[PDB]
Write a protein that binds this ligand. Structure first.
Ligand SMILES: *[C@@H]1O[C@H](CO)[C@@H](O[C@@H]2O[C@H](CO)[C@@H](O)[C@H](O)[C@H]2NC(C)=O)[C@H](O)[C@H]1NC(C)=O
Ligand SMILES: *[C@@H]1O[C@H](CO)[C@@H](O)[C@H](O)[C@H]1NC(C)=O
Ligand SMILES: *[C@@H]1O[C@H](CO)[C@@H](O)[C@H](O)[C@H]1NC(C)=O
Ligand SMILES: *[C@@H]1O[C@H](CO)[C@@H](O)[C@H](O)[C@H]1NC(C)=O
Ligand SMILES: *[C@@H]1O[C@H](CO)[C@@H](O)[C@H](O)[C@H]1NC(C)=O
Ligand SMILES: *[C@@H]1O[C@H](CO)[C@@H](O)[C@H](O)[C@H]1NC(C)=O
Ligand SMILES: *[C@@H]1O[C@H](CO)[C@@H](O)[C@H](O)[C@H]1NC(C)=O
Ligand SMILES: *[C@@H]1O[C@H](CO)[C@@H](O)[C@H](O)[C@H]1NC(C)=O
Ligand SMILES: *[C@@H]1O[C@H](CO)[C@@H](O)[C@H](O)[C@H]1NC(C)=O
Lengths: 273, 334, 42, 435, 50
């Protein structure tokens, strides 16, 4: 049911549900992190293929090089060790002549039997106390991790986190959850740049003839000398993907003038004309 | 910590080593419990520094902060991989030198030389100081540029510009920032530079660093000191028992002494495990603050400190990280 | 009066020497603040 | 590898760097040291008239050498009752002092002179102390030894005093008070109460004799109490341990057994710059011997040895943590047989000395064999079946960030993606434990 | 369970053994108490943070 609610979980509030196709949800999730619509439209097949590669890779991912996976086995081994300690410590002879009460009774007289049985009891009480104390320490651990799992289900899966680190590395797009032994297994799909370009960007642009009329980019940058490459060449790019496009009122906001804003004469952008 | 359980308990005595078999594979369990706990501490470090690790940075040079004085935060090698505050923090917290290199040779302090008598060893951290410093250095160089939706791009924006945008984003208008830009830089510098004399007894965050150090020392004091105990025995020394009592009472007396030494080791492992859970929680907190207070500007109240959050800085500390959150605090109201 | 802060009248243990430690001992010691009987010769 | 396997109890361990215990640190040879003084003259125990129980004798022996065989070879032991000591140990230990109490006493009355009793034998005459290790020996002494038993032998049966009839009871380790002895010696032997004043206090005392129970082999009680005050032993045996050396120099730089002024165990001795030196945890870390030399003392297990193991190749290497490699050759005798032979090579690292490594400038991404301080072991590419090989001594990789430099402009550089991939961060969260 | 009962019933040697048995149990109880308070302190630290 959680998987079936990801695409539809869009607007302010948690009251409504939108039966939106998964593919549409991904494209809006990508747009929301700085990839422009022209880019998403041109690369929609590429995006789906890369996503499928990254996700489908998990079919062969549950190996010894997968730390998240080995952590599942370790949780299992931890529970096994706790029981090994109850099952195995019964064989111990804690200063007694034997681990067996029956052997004590049939070998010693009635006074030494009490001493020897008490030695054996004390050891068995110690084992049980140690067991309870660790279960309690491990219960506190689980309380903390259960809390973390709740936050990730609500923040990584049922929504799109903008928090860095939380929900994984890179820019978070979508998370999925499956059950695991003793807990949950999270799979966070993030957007990871593989190659970069450095360009020069402005803090904003102003009309040199009308210095009080200034604009700033929204979800991107105003970058120079990329298209045509003549005088006062400024264009807009989404901040998560280099793809220069004309500066329009859909990419910008009007702002107060600043000392760091560029003053342009030629090929003035439509928001400033 | 790792412990040579067999040595800790029997101190080279064959009769004890035989009696110890009546407690099952006790030492094997201790060795595995400590091995596991120690692996977890390294994982806490690996994950913590995954958060500290930046994709991109702008190289640190002197004058990095522009009008804002960040000299105390930049590496000494820019103006040592460590900053002036991080050296200052490490020099004002009292820590015994573990002697990781040739420490054995120096002993041939007491909780360190006890290692080679008691039968236990303090282990070095996954990363050395240079590497951890390199990570926080790179983190400092990514603050100004960490601006838009998404974490994919990096902007090589001057620190001063980042501060002014951070202030604008919390309700201070541009006219105000422009008129008061010298005032803002001066107040910021006062507040930050104040830390050079801040590592004192009135600084709770600082005393908390010393307390973490003292806590580790106490755990070892308990391994080193409890060996001297005589747990209902005639002596704490196995050798004294053997040379004073007959072969039957020796077994009883040695068993009393073993039981006490096994108890000490079990108590040690159990606390290390309780303290490992504490560290797991705090390591998680540190990751959230690095990603939310340092690599971004939190809008969450309380989290990242008091007042309105502007910028955070991180330096390394003994057993952890030291966060310095710079906030905006009204001093007079209308 | 006996001044415990100077270890007045304190008898040192008769075995090993102790150094830079604090030892908890129950033994024959003077009482702090005790004024002993003064004797005078002439 | 075998020390690793036995330390963990597992023949199929995972790769990692594990601390290990020592399984070959056995002593070879032994050293004995004790004080030499004049003999503890015991003539007064056997060649005088036997003491009575009400007036028993005590002698305290200090700064002398004793011979317990001499005391026992003269007497026929009927019984002995020892506490926190055995006759075997009593014969060979060093003590701060040795105390002997003795008197004539019928063997038939040994139950009166006993730990749980509170008869008149104990209350008014001899109350044995148990704060120090001691042994009560009941023995028959033949007249051929010089022992005699003339006069009356008696014990106090009562000694109350004052208007409240308060029993003047003997305290452990003490004796009948002078008023009780004075009284009893003037009392009739028929057990009758005699009244007298001692100073300003009235006493009522009575006694009975046991002279009629003493015969040619004289029933005697000897109580030997020994004090242990480590570092202040003055009383030692005349007999030196048969297999122990009395010259340590030929045993230096080696794991040996020892018995030094009553302190025993195993360890390694070294000649050091300057009678027992202790740390803050009551361990002996050195001593001043009687030839003027000061020695350092360490356990035979003093080096924090750990093993680096790769379970794919079954290859291993050793770290001697915090130890300079010069000192390793000298300690070879306490390491595993194959380590000892190999030391009879080593790299110095910032975490200690490593054996079975070669220097390399290679770095490690996922470091499952961390040595510490950014050092990582890099496994061999050759399986042990072919032969042993060394590990690379490399380091943890620092994968630095891209360096984007700022402009001294009103403009700035920005690094934007040209291409991109999707990746999956996998995470497991344990939310509950087995119930 | 009473030290006074041990002292008034047994001799001076068995008293030490018996008192030590009783002490060991009382030390164990105190150690167990401190260890849980510490486990519960960590729980509180987490919940206080929440
Ligand atoms: C300790 O005392 C015993 C005597 O009880 C000594 O043994 C005697 O030695 C002489 C030779 O000097 C023999 O003639 C006796 O027959 C031995 N007697 C016994 C019972 O063995 C012994 O030598 C003394 N020990 C030391 C170190 O002097
Ligand atoms: C614009 O790009 C062209 C081609 O690389 C280059 O020759 C020109 O100098 C650049 N102009 C500016 C202002 O960067
Ligand atoms: C643009 O012009 C404005 C108004 O004159 C000035 O304040 C600002 O410094 C100028 N910026 C640049 C980049 O020239
Ligand atoms: C910057 O701070 C350092 C102390 O870290 C101080 O020595 C230096 O003089 C300060 N420089 C300025 C311009 O304030
Ligand atoms: C031993 O003591 C006796 C007195 O009991 C004395 O006569 C004898 O000479 C002493 N012998 C030595 C060697 O001191
Ligand atoms: C006991 O002493 C007598 C008289 O001196 C002697 O004749 C006899 O041999 C001695 N017997 C023993 C057992 O020592
Ligand atoms: C110990 O033996 C050595 C010879 O190996 C000798 O030179 C030294 O003087 C002897 N020391 C003593 C105290 O006898
Ligand atoms: C590592 O690089 C240094 C550079 O000076 C060189 O001296 C050294 O020999 C190199 N070692 C290896 C194993 O490559
Ligand atoms: C992006 O990288 C992939 C893998 O190297 C490659 O197949 C693809 O052609 C690249 N596309 C671009 C836009 O460079």
């Amino acid at each position: 049911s959680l998987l079936g609610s990801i695409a539809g979980a869009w607007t302010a509030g948690l009251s409504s549900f939108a039966a939106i196709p998964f593919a549409q949800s991904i494209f809006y999730r990508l747009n929301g992190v700085g990839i422009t619509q022209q880019v998403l439209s041109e690369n929609q097949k590429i995006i789906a293929n890369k996503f499928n590669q990254a996700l489908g890779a998990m079919q062969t991912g549950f190996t010894t090089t997968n730390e998240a996976f080995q952590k599942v086995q370790d949780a299992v081994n931890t529970n096994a060790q706790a029981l090994a300690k109850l099952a195995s410590e019964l064989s111990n002879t804690f200063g007694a002549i034997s681990s067996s009460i029956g052997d004590i009774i049939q070998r010693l007289d009635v006074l030494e039997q009490e001493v020897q049985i008490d030695r054996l009891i004390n050891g068995r009480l110690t084992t049980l106390n140690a067991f309870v104390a660790q279960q309690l320490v491990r219960s506190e651990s689980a309380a903390r991790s259960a809390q973390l799992a709740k936050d990730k289900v609500n923040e990584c899966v049922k929504s799109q986190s903008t928090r860095s680190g939380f929900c994984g590395q890179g820019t978070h797009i979508v998370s999925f959850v499956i059950n695991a032994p003793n807990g949950l297994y999270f799979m966070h799909v993030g957007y990871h740049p593989s190659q970069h370009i450095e360009v020069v960007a402005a803090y904003g642009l102003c009309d040199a003839a009308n210095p009080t009329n200034c604009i700033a980019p929204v979800n991107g940058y105003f970058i120079k000398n990329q298209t045509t490459r003549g005088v006062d060449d400024w264009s807009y790019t989404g901040s998560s993907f280099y793809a220069p496009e004309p500066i329009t009122t859909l990419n910008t906001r009007y702002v107060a003038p600043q000392v760091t804003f560029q003053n342009i004469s030629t090929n003035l952008p439509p928001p400033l004309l | 910590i790792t412990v040579d359980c067999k040595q800790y308990v029997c101190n080279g005595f064959a009769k004890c080593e035989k009696l110890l078999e009546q407690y099952g594979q006790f030492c094997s369990k201790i060795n595995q419990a400590l091995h596991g706990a120690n692996l977890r501490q390294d994982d806490f470090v690996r994950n913590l520094f995954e958060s500290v690790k930046t994709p991109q940075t702008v190289p640190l040079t002197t004058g990095f902060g522009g009008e804002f004085n960040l000299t105390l935060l930049e590496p000494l090698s820019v103006s040592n991989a460590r900053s002036a505050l991080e050296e200052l923090l490490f020099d004002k917290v009292t820590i015994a030198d573990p002697g990781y290199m040739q420490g054995y040779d120096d002993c041939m302090r007491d909780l360190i030389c006890a290692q080679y008598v008691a039968g236990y060893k303090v282990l070095p951290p996954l990363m050395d100081v240079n590497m951890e410093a390199a990570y926080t250095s790179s983190l400092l160089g990514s603050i100004a540029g960490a601006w838009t939706a998404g974490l994919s791009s990096f902007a090589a924006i001057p620190f001063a510009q980042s501060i002014f945008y951070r202030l604008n984003g919390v309700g201070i208008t541009q006219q105000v920032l422009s008129e008061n830009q010298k005032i803002i830089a001066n107040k910021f510098n006062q507040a930050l530079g104040a830390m050079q004399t801040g590592f004192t007894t009135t600084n709770e965050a600082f005393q908390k660093v010393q307390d973490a150090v003292n806590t580790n020392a106490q755990a070892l004091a308990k391994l080193a000191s409890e060996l001297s105990n005589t747990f209902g025995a005639i002596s704490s020394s196995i050798g004294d028992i053997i040379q004073r009592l007959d072969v039957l009472e020796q077994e009883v007396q040695i068993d009393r002494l073993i039981n006490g030494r096994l108890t000490t080791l079990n108590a040690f492992v159990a606390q290390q495990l309780v303290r490992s859970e504490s560290a797991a929680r705090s390591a998680q907190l540190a990751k959230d603050k690095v990603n939310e207070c340092v690599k971004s500007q939190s809008t969450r109240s309380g989290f990242c400190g008091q007042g309105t959050h502007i910028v955070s800085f991180v330096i390394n500390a003994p057993n952890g990280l030291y966060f310095m959150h710079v906030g905006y605090h009204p001093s007079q109201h209308i | 009066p006996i001044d415990m802060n100077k270890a007045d009248g304190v008898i040192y243990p008769n075995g090993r020497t102790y150094s830079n430690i604090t030892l908890q001992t129950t033994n024959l010691f003077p009482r702090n603040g005790d004024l002993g009987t003064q004797y005078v010769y002439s | 590898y075998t020390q690793l396997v036995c330390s963990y109890g597992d023949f199929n361990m995972k790769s990692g760097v594990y601390s290990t215990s020592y399984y070959s640190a056995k002593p070879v040879g032994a050293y004995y040291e004790a004080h030499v003084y004049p003999d503890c003259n015991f003539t007064d125990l056997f060649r005088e008239n036997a003491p009575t129980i009400m007036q028993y004798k005590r002698q305290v022996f200090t700064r002398c050498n004793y011979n317990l065989t001499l005391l026992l070879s003269l007497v026929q032991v009927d019984e002995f009752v020892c506490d926190k000591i055995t006759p075997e140990a009593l014969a060979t230990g060093c003590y701060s002092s040795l105390t002997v109490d003795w008197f004539a006493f019928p063997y038939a009355w040994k139950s009166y002179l006993a730990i749980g009793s509170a008869d008149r034998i104990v209350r008014f005459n001899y109350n044995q102390d148990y704060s120090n290790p001691s042994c009560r020996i009941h023995s028959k002494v033949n007249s051929s030894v010089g022992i005699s038993y003339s006069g009356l032998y008696s014990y106090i049966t009562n000694c109350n005093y004052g208007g409240f009839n308060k029993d003047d009871v003997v305290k452990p380790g003490g004796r009948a008070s002078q008023p009780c002895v004075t009284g009893a010696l003037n009392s009739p032997t028929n057990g009758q109460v005699w009244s007298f004043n001692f100073g300003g206090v009235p006493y009522r005392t009575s006694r009975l004799t046991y002279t009629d129970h003493l015969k040619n082999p004289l029933d005697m009680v000897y109580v030997i109490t020994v004090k242990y005050e480590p570092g202040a032993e003055t009383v030692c045996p005349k007999q030196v341990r048969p297999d122990y050396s009395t010259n340590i120099t030929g045993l230096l730089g080696s794991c040996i057994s020892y018995d030094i002024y009553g302190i025993t165990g195993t360890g390694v001795f070294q000649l050091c710059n300057a009678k027992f030196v202790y740390d803050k945890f009551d361990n002996i870390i050195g001593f001043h011997s009687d030839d003027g030399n000061y020695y350092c003392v360490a356990p035979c297990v003093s080096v924090p040895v750990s093993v680096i193991y790769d379970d794919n190749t079954n290859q291993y290497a050793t770290l001697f943590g915090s130890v300079a490699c010069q000192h390793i050759s000298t300690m070879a005798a306490q390491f595993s047989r194959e380590t000892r032979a190999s030391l009879v090579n080593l790299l110095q690292t910032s975490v200690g000395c490593v054996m079975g490594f070669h220097e390399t400038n290679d770095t490690v991404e996922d470091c499952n064999l961390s040595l510490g301080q950014s050092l990582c072991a890099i496994p061999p590419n050759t399986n042990l079946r072919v032969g042993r090989s060394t590990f690379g001594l490399g380091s943890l990789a620092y994968n630095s960030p891209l360096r984007v430099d700022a402009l001294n402009s009103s403009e700035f550089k920005v690094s934007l993606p040209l291409n991109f991939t999707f990746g999956v961060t996998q995470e497991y969260i344990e939310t509950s434990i087995q119930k």
